[PDB]
Amino acid sequence: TLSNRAQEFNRRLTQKTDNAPWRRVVYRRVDLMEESNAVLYYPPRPIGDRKNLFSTIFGLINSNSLDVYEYLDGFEAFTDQYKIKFQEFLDRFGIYYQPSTNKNAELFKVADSDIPSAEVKAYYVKEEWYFTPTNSDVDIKIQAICPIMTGQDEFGEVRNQPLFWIPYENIRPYIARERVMLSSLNNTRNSTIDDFFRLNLYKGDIVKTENLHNRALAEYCPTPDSMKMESKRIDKELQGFRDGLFVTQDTTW
Amino acid sequence: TLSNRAQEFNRRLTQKTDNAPWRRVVYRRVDLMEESNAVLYYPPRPIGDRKNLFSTIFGLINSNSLDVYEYLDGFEAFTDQYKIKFQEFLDRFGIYYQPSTNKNAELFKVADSDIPSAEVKAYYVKEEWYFTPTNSDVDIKIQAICPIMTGQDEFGEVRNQPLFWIPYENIRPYIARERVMLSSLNNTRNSTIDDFFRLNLYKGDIVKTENLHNRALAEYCPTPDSMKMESKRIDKELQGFRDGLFVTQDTTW
Amino acid sequence: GGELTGAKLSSWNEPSPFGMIQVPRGSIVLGNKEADSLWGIPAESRPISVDAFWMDRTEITNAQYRQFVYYVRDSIIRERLADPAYGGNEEYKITENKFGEPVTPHLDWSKPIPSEKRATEEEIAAINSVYYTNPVTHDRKLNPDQMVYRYEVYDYRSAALREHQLKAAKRNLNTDIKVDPNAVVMISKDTAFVDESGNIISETITRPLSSEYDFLNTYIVPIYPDETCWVNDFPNARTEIYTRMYFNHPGYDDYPVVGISWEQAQAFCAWRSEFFRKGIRLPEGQIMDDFRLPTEAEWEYAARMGDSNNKYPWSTEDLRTGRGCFLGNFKPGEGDYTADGHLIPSRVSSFSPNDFGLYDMAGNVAEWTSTAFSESGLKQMSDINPELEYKAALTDPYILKQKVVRGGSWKDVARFIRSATRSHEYQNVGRSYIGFRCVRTSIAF
Amino acid sequence: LNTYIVPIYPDETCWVNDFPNARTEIYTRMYFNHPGYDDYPVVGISWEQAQAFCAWRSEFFRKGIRLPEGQIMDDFRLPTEAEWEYAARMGDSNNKYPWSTEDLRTGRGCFLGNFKPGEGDYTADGHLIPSRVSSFSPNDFGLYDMAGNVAEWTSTAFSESGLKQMSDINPELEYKAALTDPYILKQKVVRGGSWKDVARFIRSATRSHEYQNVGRSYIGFRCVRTSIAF
Amino acid sequence: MIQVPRGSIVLGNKEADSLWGIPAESRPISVDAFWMDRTEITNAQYRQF
Amino acid sequence: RATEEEIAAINSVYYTNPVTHDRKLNPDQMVYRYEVYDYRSAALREHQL
């Protein structure tokens, strides 16, 4: 449906980290219960044709227009071995469904109340900070996002369950067309979810980093305060690299 | 019935918020037991040819000249799915009715004593404040109104019940002909309900704002005093935007 | 080739109108911030901006309108003179050039109309055709049914509308939307003519948009003042003397004209524009703006001298000077119209003028504006050059034919002579307390 | 090679269409045809018409100069939004407007540009509609009306995240939309603010946008030309 | 036309309004020298075209 | 000072309002033709001939 002009322009707007002399992969947790992060939350349930990010993802999976992969602990593998089967995802997470009246863009029949668009209150964002070899500037690229369901832990207490991994290239075309509002003080829908991610308007804390030991912060930070401290330290490291790149603000001469 | 000149004029007199760079949707509870608000209340029951706003609404619904939609908590959807069936509105709210002697302009036969013209004592007004791109001025547009019946709760206590949502475009032509009086000190019927809403002569406090969490004021304001405080804060925010638009009163030069 | 110089236009000469002053562009908060609270009328205010324009120093007087009436009389008499029914003298209607080239038939105003004593029988009949003599009182007066002015106006603003483009493809710039051949745009226009029986037929034609003639409106309006207003406005009063002598006495020549309806005022403005254009030479390409009734925003801005601190057309909040003299002609007391010295409208310029130099913006006669009346019109108008313009259909309900009136009159209380108070009257109604003045958009830099 | 045949006559009806319920037809009749408005910025000009004007200007300039063998000149063009913002702020990141101070008026109370300073008050600066060019002080670079008067076209296609997607050096987001492309893809960036804009939109950092085939009574343009300097 | 020298600048504003609901976006860039029209195009200049 | 055919050729680009009789340049006739060579697209590595 796209024109050759549009295809060329789009492929001109993709970020390439092929020959970066420096890279760093960061797994952040974005909490939807914070302003400037609820952009991906509104509306909690579909209001007419208005849907939040998880509603769009679930609808796309109900068709065959989006491939998602199982969330494994330790590593991510987006290969046909780990491709998620929509049938063996509703029962595993207690989502009631009925046979579909159509097999075109409908694998099953799931009601809006059954779809957990309001229970998903957090996302896992896998970012790659890179240094551009030709331009000599730092940039961030999105690799994948994982919705986290925040349902109620059985026998009491709460439990957060990551659902699956969505490679950002797979979902980019679909979220570049839906308009959303970026603030509660201005309800104009002048932006898109793709703009929200590309401009790095989300605020999450570092929960993991790519390291030689394959360590997550949860394995050496026992308390939430220590996890926040470690996230602050890693963010300081990233900002320190960015600042040390340049010498234009060093008046020690 | 309308001439071509009148249609052109009316189409020219509508408010368009299509390209507004700033928007804000606000829900206000307008209480009819306050002066400057009882314009929509007089007369509590029809006086010859004189009816209040709810009497007109019910009369139009008894015909097929007005489409209303269910008051759903959290969101509004003015689609045929939520269109209200008149027959299944009266027995729901305990309004005694009789079969009609004419199928034209009367779906049922309801006595004025049964119609809750005087019981409906509040309205929900869905306003949209917008900033005009071409003109660079702030305006308000009415989207829908919801009558609130305030009968006596069973077993005791009082209970306010929203009835339905009336899109303002649906009721505008009918209320632009009803001449009313805007004051008790001057009983001249020189204005209309449409002028009452367009001039923004109603006074209500904010009960909901279009925010990213789809939160209402009640969900985080326990007591009525706190509700009033939050409404005042939101009104200050709106007035602050309006004032900050311009600079002619800044004499710090 | 070369560089980017400019393709300048030939300079024009701007004729300053006689009897007018210049009102500069500016801004003002229309309306009153505080209400009476005993009139039960909520306060409505709105800040707006307007451009500079010429405005008549005083209201139109009886003599100034008699000029229009006399022009209509002379034109009709000349048309009848060069007519087979009454006269036949073709010298009164030029239809050819000196070289014999057929040209548009038009009257020859150079030749004087025959005097009643020196005119032949047919000329006397043609002259008398426009007069009526009372069979009882034997008084000869211009026949109001014969004093009709014909004129056409082009709707520039309607012709410029995107929806009214003469090409369908040019009616929508969004390239996602296709042009539907079956789509027709309905337009309304006013036309008027004289049938063989001699009656005036006026109608509103509604048809699909096909040509530029869809934006031309034609009117034939009886323009003789309605002198009976004095009798009809005031029952149980001895006001027939004014119905007999106000518009017909030389002593009232400089008094404002009353009994003029909105349509008659528009006809007078059109005639004034035609007269002014006829009496001037214009360089090639020159475009001038016609005389018109002011918008209510323009009127309020001019009356208050472009200052929002003024409630009247004077700086002080009081209605009298330090010596106790009233600043306008209105009804200051109860049953007491003469506290200011005048009972009925006084001679124009009898009080002090504005800072803009305008007279009788408060009191004397209330003044027509071009704005259609709406209870919420200040909110419905634009921020710049505000205007609410409605051309009512002939078969529209009477309620849609009301026009805003500004200023207050000799019979109004101090509340209604405030520059922010709005009144209204039906467009076909003339009153003994409503006159008007004209404005003209000024090309100023 | 891209060939265009563009109707280049200004859309004078913009005055009527931009402002419903106003007496603006006088400007639709006189603004582009009166000798008194000769030195006023041209409005009602579309992005495509501005591009055609720049091409004609380049052709006209070439037709009237003798060039030694091998000399290749750059054509006139609309500025990029980055170029425009750099020139408006005098290449200084401490400036919010095309002037040094943060205020909007001088010490004597005079406004620094032609915009809408007050509520319903366009004439606070002395002008309601666009004023004659060079009516206020210029930049340090020597540019006039970079804030107010008419907002100005740029060659950059509009994207909500366009600052992030452009390059560090000579940034440009260029798009040649197809005829059958959805209308949303044909928006171009506009800069500077106009006579009808609040102080926020005459800030040199605020970005507006307009469809490439739409002319407005508040959008003009100026040309730039890459200079061969050493 | 006047000459605009090559240089660098941080496009955008660091601080937002918080009442317009538009987050601040800033980016430092560099541009080369170019000629720019002293004023915006006037009516006569377009009338030439 | 022109001839009949010259007058026809000159008037071909003008339009007169049949009502008010104003002769103005016909906007539908004021069309400019021009070509632009895309140097940047021709220099792309993927666009080598």
Ligand SMILES: *[C@H]1O[C@H](CO)[C@@H](O[C@@H]2O[C@@H](C)[C@H](O)[C@@H](O)[C@H]2O)[C@H](O)[C@@H]1O[C@H]1O[C@H](C(=O)O)[C@@H](O[C@H]2O[C@H](CO)[C@@H](O[C@@H]3O[C@@H](C)[C@@H](O)[C@@H](O)[C@@H]3O)[C@H](O)[C@H]2O)[C@H](O)[C@H]1O
């Ligand atoms: C005078 O006015 C009365 C109306 O008050 C007319 O009487 C009406 O019509 C008659 C036929 C009936 O008895 C009634 O219906 C009655 O109400 C009466 O006919 C006269 O008006 C008419 O004649 C005028 C005249 O001959 O002067 C016309 O004036 C204009 O006529 C020309 C029309 O093209 C115009 O010339 C044109 O413009 C000028 C600037 C120049 O360019 C020239 O070359 C053009 O041809 C004149 O300048 C006008 O004065 C009047 O319109 C017409 O109704």
Ligand SMILES: *[C@H]1O[C@H](CO)[C@@H](O[C@@H]2O[C@@H](C)[C@H](O)[C@@H](O)[C@H]2O)[C@H](O)[C@@H]1O[C@H]1O[C@H](C(=O)O)[C@@H](O[C@H]2O[C@H](CO)[C@@H](O[C@@H]3O[C@@H](C)[C@@H](O)[C@@H](O)[C@@H]3O)[C@H](O)[C@H]2O)[C@H](O)[C@H]1O
């Ligand atoms: C208003 O409209 C009525 C018609 O409804 C006009 O006709 C009058 O009414 C009849 C009954 C009486 O016998 C006469 O008094 C007669 O004049 C009336 O005068 C008013 O006319 C005005 O409105 C017309 C309209 O909108 O129809 C104007 O346009 C008409 O005249 C044009 C003259 O050139 C004519 O164009 C010519 O014919 C067409 C077919 C085409 O060949 C074109 O190129 C020609 O120039 C229009 O089609 C008519 O519609 C009229 O000028 C104006 O005074």
Ligand SMILES: *[C@H]1O[C@H](CO)[C@@H](O)[C@H](O)[C@@H]1O
């Ligand atoms: C909290 O404290 C623990 C123990 O020192 C650290 O591992 C963690 O990084 C945070 O500082």
Ligand SMILES: *[C@H]1O[C@H](CO)[C@@H](O)[C@H](O)[C@@H]1O
């Ligand atoms: C009353 O107080 C509560 C608690 O501070 C607030 O939530 C509410 O908005 C109002 O101020």
Ligand SMILES: [Ca+2]
């Ligand atoms: Ca007066």
Ligand SMILES: [Ca+2]
């Ligand atoms: Ca400018």
